Design a protein around this nucleic acid. Structure first.
Lengths: 107, 94, 91, 84, 89, 103, 79, 96, 84, 93, 108, 92, 89, 104, 79, 96
DNA sequence: CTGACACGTGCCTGGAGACTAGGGAGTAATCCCCTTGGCGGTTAAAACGCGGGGGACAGCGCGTACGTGCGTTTAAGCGGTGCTAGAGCTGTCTACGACCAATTGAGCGGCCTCGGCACCGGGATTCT
DNA sequence: AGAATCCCGGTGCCGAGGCCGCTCAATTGGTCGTAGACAGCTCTAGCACCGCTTAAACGCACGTACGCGCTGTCCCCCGCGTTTTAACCGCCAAGGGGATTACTCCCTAGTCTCCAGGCACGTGTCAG
DNA sequence: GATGTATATATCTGACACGTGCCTGGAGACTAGGGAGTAATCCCCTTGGCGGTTAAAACGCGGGGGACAGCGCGTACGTGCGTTTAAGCGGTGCTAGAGCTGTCTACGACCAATTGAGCGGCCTCGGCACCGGGATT
DNA sequence: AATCCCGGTGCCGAGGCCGCTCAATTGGTCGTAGACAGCTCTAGCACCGCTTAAACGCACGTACGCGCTGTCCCCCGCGTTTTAACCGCCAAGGGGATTACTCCCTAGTCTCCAGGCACGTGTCAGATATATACATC
């Protein structure tokens, strides 16, 4: 007689039901257990928040207020865990960190 | 100015700047030049050329990084073609 | 119609930094990042099922994939809040 | 009747210098440009052949950038930004 | 534990006449077959999915073979599969 | 009359079709997939063994052992590309000394 | 202490197989270090597989799967 | 007394060990080292007899590959001896 | 495992000296013999290719002399003596 | 004997005769070699190799007569390779 | 029914008019064959056979032998200034060559 | 059975040199010569019939082919032989 | 008079639709076609009679094609001959 | 009614070649597949000639093919020349081909 | 005496097309003889075809056929 | 003013290989053909095309013979073609 | 200062609430093999010392290679007119492959063996 | 001169290979839900082409910083010797836990519903 | 210093390129019967394996006759001009004979009953070849 | 020293007879196409005047083919060694060559309708003309 969303049950922002659907249609297995999409949504939300916090701090260092791909590059390439997770990836517009090798700089 | 002072300025700049650096039109014709050997009268979405150009610039920058390390190990500062060859071989693509 | 995550990244951004906006390009990047990590985890979960000749994916397969793929400091906090979420859901 | 002559000079030496000036490069041997263009051609061929293979399987005559993304991804060099 | 060993042995007796094969090499071959099977079925699945098609057909396997194998091996593999499917038809 | 004998193949079309369906690759599998796949796997098997037996004959031995397989795979300029990351137990290495090291 | 059970002559023999004619004496402790970091990685993965199965013995398949995941596939031990 | 020149035997060692296919590290010490590392991630583990051989084959193949790369780095440096910097460059370009 | 190897030294230099002596040749530069084998090889390649083509169309495994006679006639240098 | 006293005698001798002059066995082994390119498992009837030998020996005698005429035209007694290459070109080979 | 008298014996020929007419019809040269073709063709084939054999027997007689062998047929065909034109491309097995030395080669 | 012209060549031989026999190698050469000239003449006779839109090879076609294929003096005597043969056959 | 003067034009339009052909060169093409036709039909007829066969099949055409045309033409010609025949049948 | 050449996907007439075979006496039987194969072969060779001739034309920037272009075609492909060596083409002329010893 | 109508200039120009840079003064009469032989060997065949057809007019198809039988097939005037 | 030997012969060679007109005159050849033919049969008649086909064949034959003659001429290390070059070429070709 | 971001509106098709059927996984009990444990001995290998000359690498010299700066010139980027190939959607229907069932012989596990390999040793040749 | 590699010969064993039982996974005959092969439409955005702009492309001069070379030296590793220790083989114990099984259930896929979340489509203002 | 071919703008006229009628060449379908595909066999002639001796092939020597690199030379033919002639053009005129329609009958395609001319086989006996010695070139 | 010529030995090939069967012969009808008769309209031969491009004869200059000379190095004639060709005997089995059953493929026939081949059209691609540039020797 009333409807309340599973993500609001879980206390998550990400959609539980969309992940559950995407699993079942992805053929990854012939069964999906009820707890899996909550866990997976929580993991993805955690990683999203971890990226966005660093991107926000990079934006504040520029005193900008709009996040742009440069700031995501600055986030990923400055956390030793994020870089190890995301080593095989090129980010559009991202450029590089300023990183002159010590032998090159003058005496 | 003496050698390298402006090269230093350029490196600091272009590591700061983030625009694409190859000219669109030449790269576009070079796509239109090569693909035809596989199939003539190919057509291209305008985005696909940009995605190609992004990939090729990232790949070449990373190669130049590895090359520069190879160069300092020889205790040179000039990158040499043999540095490219060695880098490519240890990477395992040559 | 296209599905996307373009609501939920914004919600999380409002929780982390309610002053800050995000460009549509960076939203697209986030969308591909989410699709990528999703496919990695779902892949290794499917592998870990078949090695044991099991048929389903449970929370355990997600947890083990999470410990295999993410470096060690992420893995603890992720598994903690995964089990916190699941305890809330099942309660 | 039109058939393309080479545009091998089209990737100007200024353009290669500007790219290399992103990767830390103080200095460049003058013999680098030929080797670079060779390497670049090899790479382009190895991507386009896959792209065109995907184009053909879909029977499309127009190449779509998703083809390029998938060409990179199968080759391992995944690209974020033009799709997902 | 089903294995491909008998089929490798049959194939061996069509290329070299008086030669036998150790179990260590047989186990290597038995792993090689499984590896290339998994790779090809992988890419065939992706090609089916991207075009919104439900089905893997001979076209998907051909396209995967052209993508995974080097060019001359791809040519002769396609020639073999074409001859097989034609004569089977 | 087994489908392998219609295709003219030794590899088991039945088994490879079963494994295509059971492997969760796609929700439908057409009859042209397994014949083509089994034919290509036969081809590559025979390809490797034909080189391996030559090495074995040069060894003047009646038996193929892994050292011969490693010589096969690493000598062919294209199989080395397909199996470039693979390492073979008990296989050893190809004889390889840089010219600068010799007198 | 068991790190010193990989003796100097064993490192010599391995460097000989890879075509190394002359070796500086500092290489040995570095080589033991590199080997240790490799072993730590592989064993951590192996144990993770063993635990998800609720086994107590490490099996060879656990090692084969771990090596495949790391991307350096081993042929010879089944799988 | 008879004495070969320096390196006359080193080449013979190369030719000898590239021809053969045996394992070269002592089995028992290697197994003890394996049991010493595994004790960190769990206690009262056990190992099947083949698992330690699989680990030894993997580790020996890894080190032979690293040594060939080290030798190419040393020759690039205009040297015959391999030194630690050649390992550290090899590992950097490999992305380790 | 039985496979042939080059026998091109088999046509002995004395044999060619005797042939050229049937042509009435008096004096011969030594460089001649390897050219002469090369020419002979191109000839043999041609004739045998034709012969094999005939053998195959009949689905035979033995080369018959009529295959040779017909190939020679098609080349236009008719041989009398072997039937046909 | 003086140089060429016997060369003439050999000419007179062999033009009188009608035997085959290449060694049969090596010619056969060369035929069995060349055939190996266009197929394996080929066999040759005993007369076939003789037919081939007759053909090739007469071909070469004709080429050598043409070569000799070319050499004489060159104001030379020795035949040299250029004389073959011209002979073949005017023949259109 | 009259007693047979072979058409060769009406033409005054030894060559088989019946066989040559059969081979003209069966050889797919044309869809109709008239009775004047085979007699004429057989006559010309007889003429050319006797022409060659008359020279070959003379060569055989100069060899002081009772038998004709291919050497003598080569002598006949290559000596006649017109038969050499008809059979100029033909080569005869075991035939060899006519003795032929350019005058420049011989000594003064 | 491999039909051959051998008996007819042997009959002709015993009218020019009644002392002489002939080896089988030479007999096989003659047996090939007959087949060769037969095929050439029937060839050109066929073409001459076709070009004039006639259905038929007659004595005129064989005469014309003979004058085209043989050298002149041989053509003259061949025509004289064929003419005498066809005349006496017609008179029969 | 019959001639091939339609079909050469059609093929030309496929190859180069902007381009014209002079009637002299059309006559040349007509004689070229008649010549190669007569060569192939000749050798097919020979290859029938050597085997004491009565018909001309596709095999006789294929073998004549391989005998008369140089090696690079022969492959592509036989390929599209068999492609045409598979479509027809 | 639908034409056999449009069945075959060929421009050249299948039925005309089939008729010309039967009336050429080349054999007492003709098999059904032969004229398709033969038409495909003749069309292939015609296309190969015309393509080269067209490129010769546009080298001149002419737009009408004339026999000189066909001579330039045949004498510049090593397979066509070997197929067509015993042939003279009217109006065709020769290729510019001075021998190297003659040039100064 | 119509053979004088093949003038020396008409010969020289054909030698030029054949590539001849320098021409000996005795070449012309030999060339005329060679042409006369070729013409006779073609016309005799042409006239034989004309006679078998009973025509009194020579047709260019006869010349084509005279060349074709003699091996020197001509494209352009027929087919 | 005067050009030196061969330079205009060079201009002639390049021209006549570039040009493609028939080089023998029509009327003299037409009479020569009539003169030869009447010895085989008087009161013959000719289609106007048959003369052109004859002239085409004759020009092509002579051009080919002169090519072979020039090769025979350079073999003797001359540049002047000689009657013996024609005779040799004709003999090797097999028509003499 | 101008348009990308950030907001507001309609609405439809994706999700949630509830009942259903039946089979994938959790359980208790077992077997037994292959893993961990101890012991002897000899002898391969590792360890410790010696000798020394060939390697790594620190130094001075040098001439050329390409980094920095300018005037010339050219075509990449911009705004725009114009079209229509083909990309993307709606409609029809029928070619085909998912899933059942009765049937049976192709491939796996086992015993046996006999001979190819390996282990053994002696004499000739290469090479330092 | 003489050390190590090579090559030729004999012994005897334990692994590959043949036959055997046998059973479970492949085969054939079959229906039927469908989605994808084809037909038609239609409207985006791609390619062709026009004039304008001036940023960038280009060739050149020139200056000295750098890579390559010859030289030295000393110290540390390779080749060799004597000692000694724990590896390696092999025999005898024994019991923990991999691997298999029969019962059971509570968990998930399937289905109809209906209503509201978020995804096109319209807007304008404040961040750049 | 100055003559060759290349290139640009314009005229104009007819060869190419198109459109029309229509008829005879092709396609759709059914029919009859025989050329080629098949399964099984035989056996011969091809490829396998060995010994021995000795012709042939191979390696070295000697050396002088050949290929071919050089200077000399005188004439043979390419270049350039003024004279003259007849090949090419447009045209009037005719009619020999080339090409088509009509008639019909001389003849050769195809059947059949008949039978002896030519092929495959055994036998042999003597012409050739193999052998050797003495005279001449 | 090698070619020639005269003489003796003995064998395996040509040549005769024999069986026999299948391909040539004779008598015959009949569909036809080609031999002859007649027409008629093309284009070939004959003749005329005009045009000027080409052919012809000549001068002349030096580039080229023919000749004499040299030399050095490489095969041709000869010797000693040695090796695998050649002969001949014994094995054996793959695949050429033949056969009896069967069928599914192609030639034959009537149809009718539309593809492409004569006959009418006109316009734009080219040749021709004029102009003139710069490459070459």
């Amino acid at each position: 007689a009333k409807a309340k969303s599973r993500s609001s049950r879980a206390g998550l922002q990400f959609p539980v039901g969309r992940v559950h659907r995407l699993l079942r249609k992805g053929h990854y297995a012939e069964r999906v257990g009820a707890g899996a999409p909550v866990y997976l949504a929580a993991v993805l939300e955690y990683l999203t928040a971890e990226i966005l916090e660093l991107a926000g701090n990079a934006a504040r260092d520029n005193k900008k207020t709009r996040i742009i791909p440069r700031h995501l590059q600055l986030a990923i390439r400055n956390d030793e865990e994020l870089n190890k997770l995301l080593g095989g990836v090129t980010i559009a517009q991202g450029g590089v960190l300023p990183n002159i090798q010590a032998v090159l700089l003058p005496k | 100015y003496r050698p390298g002072t402006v090269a230093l300025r350029e490196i600091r700049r272009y590591q700061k700047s983030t625009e694409l650096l190859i000219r669109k039109l030449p790269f576009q014709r070079l796509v239109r030049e090569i693909a035809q050997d596989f199939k003539t009268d190919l057509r291209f979405q305008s985005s696909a050329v940009m995605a190609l150009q992004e990939a090729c610039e990232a790949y070449l920058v990373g190669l130049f990084e590895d090359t520069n390390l190879c160069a300092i190990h020889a205790k040179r500062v000039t990158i040499m073609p043999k540095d490219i060859q060695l880098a490519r071989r240890i990477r395992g693509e040559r | 119609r296209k599905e996307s995550y373009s609501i939920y990244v914004y919600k999380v951004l409002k929780q982390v930094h309610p002053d800050t906006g995000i460009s549509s390009k960076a939203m697209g990047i986030m969308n591909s990042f989410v699709n990528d990590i999703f496919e990695r985890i779902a892949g290794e979960a499917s592998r870990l099922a078949h090695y044991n000749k099991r048929s389903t994916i449970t929370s355990r397969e997600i947890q083990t994939a999470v410990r295999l793929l993410l470096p060690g400091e992420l893995a603890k906090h992720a598994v903690s809040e995964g089990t916190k979420a699941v305890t809330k859901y099942t309660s | 009747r039109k058939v393309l002559r080479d545009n091998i000079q089209g990737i100007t030496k200024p353009a290669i210098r500007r790219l290399a000036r992103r990767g830390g490069v103080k200095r460049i041997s003058g013999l680098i440009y030929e080797e670079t263009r060779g390497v670049l051609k090899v790479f382009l061929e190895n991507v386009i052949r896959d792209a065109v293979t995907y184009t053909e399987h879909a029977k499309r005559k127009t190449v779509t950038a998703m083809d390029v993304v998938y060409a990179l991804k199968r080759q391992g060099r995944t690209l974020y930004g033009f799709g997902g």
